[PDB]
Design a protein around this ligand. Structure first.
Ligand SMILES: O=P(O)(O)OP(=O)(O)OP(=O)(O)OC[C@H]1O[C@@H](n2cnc3c(O)ncnc32)[C@H](O)[C@@H]1O
Ligand SMILES: O=P(O)(O)OP(=O)(O)OP(=O)(O)OC[C@H]1O[C@@H](n2cnc3c(O)ncnc32)[C@H](O)[C@@H]1O
Ligand code: NA
Ligand code: NA
Ligand code: NA
Ligand code: NA
Ligand code: NA
Ligand code: NA
Lengths: 185, 185
């Protein structure tokens, strides 16, 4: 089937297309700006986005909201991961984490899917830790400073395939695909 | 006249009431949660808030959205000043500004007012610099680390009256009051 991915993030598109493409699903990116509310939960941002987008973009469509939540920073940047990335950057995160030994954090991805007048959500979480310095040139955003649990390499040191197998987005996609198999045969 | 101030911030209420009270205006705080969109401009957050609140709260009513925009941090925390304050706090800002000599920044306040089916906005901006350490116990939020231009004391070292005479909120209120004088006699 064909799904329109409403996003401005090219990295997210590659990861989604790579994952679902292997199952014959066609992903077409569509950069259509939509309202993102300030909220504590990525789920709420997605709900609002879908409600606003319905009737304005082709169907079926999907959107995604994700963030990096750092323990020693009380969850920051979280829902505002994008804004923080564009302002203080990875250097800012590292500066804030200077000297800290508890570098635990988690990435969370929430995918929203809309089809036949109904909305559905899928999520995935991957805990890890913030590295001491930037490492790797693959991926995007915070990938250079995030090491998923059970791995020595940062997301930036992995191929798209390796990242999808361990990331928050990969887990959300797995849940999404399992739902498609039993519902949208 | 009586105005309902839709906010959860007690500091903002004291400052607004103190300012407008001197002109016989009654301010009644009403904690009614309303959607705040993610945006680049405080003005957009206010527009959305008013559009959602109309018909849900008594009239006339006002809301306010403000933030601290730090130059060396590319405007951060800005529109997300509240979230940042609750997570990394003043310590986070100081840590990020460690060693920096260009500590310029500005506070901006945008007040939205709704009456007789129409919305109106008023704003004020006050440039200053981030101090090297926390100073003062008056005010709220970032007051302990913000020194308005032309002053040696941080907002936290001033009385409500002294702060209103120099702050972004005080300027927005001045514009708001001047508008009331010529329109809502
Ligand atoms: O909202 P769209 O249009 O989909 O694209 P976006 O870049 O704005 O994506 P979000 O608003 O949902 O949150 C984006 C931030 O989260 C971070 N992020 C999300 N997933 C990531 C991943 O897999 N690897 C590294 N960083 C990621 C990234 O640094 C971004 O600045
Ligand atoms: O939105 P309401 O319900 O009115 O209350 P709020 O606290 O959430 O206010 P905002 O969302 O508009 O942005 C709040 C942040 O901006 C900062 N701030 C705003 N005005 C300030 C002032 O005059 N002095 C110090 N900090 C201020 C403060 O630290 C807050 O965390
Ligand atoms: Na998003
Ligand atoms: Na977002
Ligand atoms: Na976004
Ligand atoms: Na506000
Ligand atoms: Na706000
Ligand atoms: Na707010």
């Amino acid at each position: 089937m064909k799904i329109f991915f409403i996003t401005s993030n090219p990295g997210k598109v590659r990861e989604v297309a790579n994952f679902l493409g292997t199952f014959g699903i066609e992903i077409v990116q569509l950069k259509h700006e939509y309202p993102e509310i300030q909220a504590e939960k990525l789920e709420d941002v997605v709900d609002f986005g879908i409600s606003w987008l319905k009737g304005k973009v082709p169907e079926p469509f999907m959107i995604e909201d994700s963030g990096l939540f750092i323990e020693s920073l009380k969850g920051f940047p979280g829902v505002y991961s994008s804004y923080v990335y564009r302002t203080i950057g990875l250097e800012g995160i590292l500066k804030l984490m200077e000297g800290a030994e508890d570098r635990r954090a988690y990435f969370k991805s929430v995918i929203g899917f809309y089809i036949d007048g109904k909305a559905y959500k899928f999520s995935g979480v991957t805990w890890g830790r913030i590295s001491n310095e930037k490492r790797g040139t693959h991926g995007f955003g915070y990938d250079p400073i995030f090491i998923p649990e059970g791995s020595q390499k940062t997301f930036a040191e992995m191929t798209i395939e390796e990242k999808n197998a361990l990331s928050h987005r990969g887990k959300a996609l797995k849940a999404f695909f399992e739902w498609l198999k039993v519902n949208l045969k």
